[PDB]
Each structure stands twice: as C-alpha cells, then as structure tokens.
Design a protein around this nucleic acid. Structure first.
Ligand SMILES: [Eu+2]
Length: 601
DNA sequence: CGC
C-alpha cells in the first residue's frame, strides 16, 4: 500500500523554497505535472511533483478546488518560484513522457530545459518490443512494484473525477509516487543503457532531442477546412446511394454489400468461382481480379472504400478541431512502433489513402492560414536508397547517382533491354520486386501481387539477384547476425530484438526473418527522419523565420511557410534535410508548395 | 504515450 506518511504535501512557500534549494544541488531529479485534462493545449495545471532521491518525493497542489479545499500555494506564485529551476538547461530532469510536461509549462510562458532523461524512451531504446512503455507496465517490469492507478483515485465512467476534485492527500500519494518511481526506473535503466554504444547514441542524439520538437509540432496543430470536409461528406452520401443502385441494377433485388453472405449468393451464382475475398487481404483479393472485366465486383470494391473513408476522416476530422486554437492537434507516439518510426492518432495521418483520388480530397482540407502556403518536404524512396547502401551494390548505387528511375533501371537490367524502351508492365514488375525485397517478400507473394504464375516470379528474382548480387549478400548476412545475436540494428545503432528467430515454429520464425531484413531499412529511415526534424527545428528556434513545422507522415515533413519567404525557406529546409543527417546514404529531398497539403504533395 |  502507500499511506500519507511516505511523501510530503507542500502547502507553504517556506517549504517549497527549502525543496527548490535541495533540487538545485541534486545531480538529476524527477518531476511530473498533474492537470485537469489529457488535452495538452487547453489543460490546466493542477499540481506538480518532484523526487530528489529514492523514497524522497513531494507534491505541490496549486489548483484543487473541491468544496472546502485547504489553502494551497497559488499557481502563479509556485510557478514564478519554480521557473528559474525549470528553465535551467544545467538542472537535469527525469520524467515519464516529458513531451506532455513540457507543453503544460509552455501554457504559462515557461520553457522547460534540461530535458535529459525520459524513462519512456529509456525503456523503448533498451528493447522496443519488451512490452508496453507506460509507467504502470514499467514499474511492474523493472521494480516488481504496482503503482497507484489513475482510476484508483479518480474513478471510472463518465462520473470520473478530474485531478482538481481529488483530495490533497489522495492526489499527493499518486503524484509523489510517480515522481519517485520514475527516478528509480531511471536509476535502473540508465546504467544498462550504457553497455552498448549503439542504443546509447540513438537515445541521446535522436530520441531525447526529439521530445521538445514533437511537443512543438503537436501544440502548433494543423489548419483544417471543415466546409470542404462537409461538402465531401454530402457528396459521398450521394455517391454511396448511386453505387448501391448500380449494384442492384446489375443483378436483382436489394442486399448488403457484405461478402460471405449477400455477395456469394450473387457473384458466383451468376458465374465465377466459389471463394470470397477478405477485407490475408493484401495478397488475395478475389474481388479486384474480376474487376478487370466483370462490372459488379468492381462497384462493391469502390463502395466499401468510400464508406470506410467518410466515417473515418470526413465525419471525424471536423469534430477534432480544438475550440481554443481552432486547429487540429494530432497525437504523435514516439515509443510505440517496433522499428522506431513515429506513429500517429486522432487523426492517424498515415491511413489517409495516398494513391487514391479520394485521399487527395482529404488532403485538400489541410490548408494554410492567410498569407501562408503549405510546404511539403519528402525523402524520395528513402528505404530503397537505404537498401542500396546496405547491399553495397554498384548497380543500384549508380542508378541513384545518375538520377535515373530505379524501377526502370532495375527492369532494364533484369529483362536485359535499353532504358528508354522499358515498358510500363516491365517497370511495374521491377517495382514489385524492389519493394518486395524491403519487406522480405517470398517469391510466391510477388506472384500474387504481379498476377504471374509461381516460378515465373522466381525466374525474375533469380535474374535480379544475379544482376544485383550485393542484395542477396545483405539478405543472407542479415538473417545470419539475427540468429547469432537475437537482434538486428540500424545504421545509427537502433535495435529490434527478434525472440522468434530460433522459434522452432514454422511461420512464427518466418515472420522473425522477414523482420530481420526489413527493420534495418525501416529503422534507418526513421532515424534519418528524426535527425532532420531535430535539425530543422534547431534552425527554426535559433533564426525565428516565418514557418511552423506542422506534420510528419511517412517519409515527409510538412510546414506552413509565409508566401513572401517560400524561396529562401525552401532552399534552407532542403539543405538541412539532405545534408545535415547521414552522409553515407544517397538522399534526395523533393520540396513542393501550394494552397493546401494536396497541392504541395 | 499523457490526465
Ligand atoms: Eu503523473
């Protein structure tokens, strides 16, 4: 258990000043903030907690306001006394997801510096797939300690209390323990993080520096036109009605556009071959085969897609606009993917269809405020260039070197013919091979994407490996070190542990082998993208130009740049992205601009 | 992930 005896509750300036003096001389100290909401931009600071040493932590309530709440130091007085310490780059801080804490302080004109250790990121760099990297999971994993849960003090359901409604002492037990546990977690993980220069490098120079830039991107938000979004919605309703009619008109009667129920009773009952097509799916889509000649399955295909899109983005996005800023603030996750790439939610910017006309209309709703323009900076096929570097292949390297289209260059070599004459079907075959290799695609999966028979796909792969020998070496060498040491690394030293590499189970092990080939390339892209963000944000912070970094999705960074400064700024972003990251992989940055995200894209 |  945890009583009111463990940690102290600071209710007076004199005691707060005694603690600030102790904090000033501590080598590092843990700190956490408590608020009345998860929404960073509109949340109010309810209190703060600190920990100077294991077992020694305190809670400073500043805004609890339930009926008859005891006097507390005022939020303004507490912050002005704490400000010097918080803004001191030399006073080192530890915390669980400091991104959140940095933002809250920003709501009060305070610039959190000394953002040295994030236990969430410590855990993530040590072993990204060890489990969840939230504090409750961390405490139980590294300390066999079960923390007080937020529900334990606030409750559940709609009648859950906000932090300011909880009693001083209850709040104190919770907040002070977090600070305490965080420091203990750091003390256990920080030493471990040094047994290897790779992970240590990524944590120190990539992850940690990225904490404040992610906070700034999240707090900046993105401008979204709800009118455009609504037009699109109304139109889609009309297109869904029409499409349904087109389906009915083709056969007879009414029905759901649900397979293995209403479709099979129609489609194969009027000629075709029995099996269905799962919405397993990105390998066998029976419905889009028939689509090249058959009309019905083609309309059902396009119907489902528009249905998904409308409810996921057209109807959701407008509801995500924040009343305080009038912008949408997406949640970026730094410690979630196995490979190290950032992920996104509310909205999940990465699920907006790219090569689909409708997804483009979603992107047009992402606009620039008056006098500004949206600028998109993207790393052209970064993972493909990374694979070229990793395989040391002179052919692939030279293709990128002389500005030729790698897919046409690849097909020119694989099919043995002039570059100017390679056909679209040949370029399409080479493209499938090139991207298949990055995911470690089996010679049969390639056959299912290209629609060619098995062994005809194999015929192509053998010709590829013979023309580009260095790629097979990489594949073999990577599957080798994966078994020998249970993990693979990126160019910067980031690791992906593969427990199922010697699984003794068939497919469970196959998966581990696919991850072995893929992760080094995907993780390296992520490391590169993270370094560009840090580099770009540094310039932004020092030079103060008229530009905001507003998004990060796939291999691109999106900004809002003033119309009168677009040229000078584009020159600068470009140089930062293709020169101040890794000097080994041959990188190319495509910069564009427009009135909205789709125009610059 | 964070209250
Ligand atoms: Eu907390």
């Amino acid at each position: 258990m945890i009583s009111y005896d463990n940690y102290v509750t600071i209710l007076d300036e004199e005691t707060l000043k005694a603690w600030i003096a102790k904090l000033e001389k501590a080598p590092v100290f843990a700190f956490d903030t408590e608020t009345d909401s998860l929404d960073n931009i509109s949340a109010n600071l309810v209190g703060l907690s600190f920990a100077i040493e294991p077992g020694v932590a305190a809670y400073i309530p500043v805004a609890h306001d339930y009926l008859d709440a005891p006097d507390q130091i005022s939020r303004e007085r507490a912050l002005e006394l704490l400000k010097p310490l918080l803004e001191d780059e030399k006073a080192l801080k530890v915390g669980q997801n400091l991104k959140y804490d940095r933002g809250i302080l920003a709501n009060y004109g305070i610039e959190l510096r000394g953002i040295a250790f994030d236990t969430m990121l410590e855990s993530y760099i040590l072993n990204s797939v060890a489990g969840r990297h939230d504090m409750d999971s961390l405490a139980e994993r590294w300390l066999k300690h079960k923390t007080i849960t937020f529900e334990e003090i606030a409750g559940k359901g709609k009648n859950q209390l906000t932090f300011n409604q909880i009693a001083l002492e209850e709040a104190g037990r919770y907040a002070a323990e977090d600070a305490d546990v965080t420091l203990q977690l750091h003390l256990k993980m920080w030493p471990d993080l040094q047994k290897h220069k790779g992970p240590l490098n990524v944590f120190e120079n990539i992850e940690m520096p990225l904490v404040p830039v992610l906070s700034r991107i999240e707090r900046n938000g993105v401008k979204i036109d709800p009118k455009v979004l609504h037009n699109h919605s109304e139109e889609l309703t009309l297109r869904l009605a029409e499409l349904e009619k087109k389906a009915h008109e083709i056969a007879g009667e009414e029905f759901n556009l649900s397979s293995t129920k209403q479709l099979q009773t129609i489609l194969f009952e009027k000629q075709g071959i029995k099996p269905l097509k799962k919405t397993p799916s990105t390998s066998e889509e029976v419905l889009e085969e028939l689509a090249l000649d058959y009309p019905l399955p083609k309309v059902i295909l396009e119907y489902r897609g528009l249905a998904k899109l409308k409810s996921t983005y057209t109807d959701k996005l407008p509801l995500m606009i924040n009343p305080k800023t009038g912008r949408v603030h997406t949640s970026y996750h730094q410690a979630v993917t196995a490979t190290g790439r950032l992920s996104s939610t509310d909205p999940n910017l990465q699920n907006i269809p790219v090569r689909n006309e409708e997804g483009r209309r979603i992107r047009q709703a992402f606009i620039a405020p008056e006098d500004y323009v949206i600028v998109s900076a993207d790393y052209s096929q970064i993972e493909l260039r990374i694979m070229a570097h990793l395989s040391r292949d002179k052919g692939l390297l030279t293709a990128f070197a002389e500005g030729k289209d790698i897919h046409r260059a690849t097909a020119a070599e694989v099919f043995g013919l002039p570059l100017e004459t390679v056909t679209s079907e040949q370029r399409r075959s080479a493209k499938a091979i090139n991207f298949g290799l990055i995911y470690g695609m089996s010679a049969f999966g390639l056959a299912r994407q290209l629609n060619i028979p098995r062994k005809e796909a194999q015929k192509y792969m053998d010709l590829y490996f013979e023309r580009y020998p260095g790629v097979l070496e990489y594949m073999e060498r990577t599957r080798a070190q994966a078994k020998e040491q249970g993990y693979v690394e990126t160019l910067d030293g980031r690791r992906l542990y593969l427990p199922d590499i010697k699984s003794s189970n068939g497919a469970r092990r196959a998966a581990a082998e696919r991850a072995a080939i893929n992760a080094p390339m995907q993780g390296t892209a992520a490391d590169i993208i993270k370094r560009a963000m840090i580099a770009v944000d540094a310039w932004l912070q020092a030079e103060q130009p008229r530009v905001r970094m507003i998004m990060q999705v796939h291999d691109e960074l999106v900004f809002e740049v003033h119309k009168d400064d677009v040229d000078a700024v584009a020159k600068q972003i470009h140089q930062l992205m293709e020169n101040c990251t890794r000097l080994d992989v041959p990188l190319l940055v495509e910069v564009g601009s427009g009135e909205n995200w789709d125009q610059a894209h």
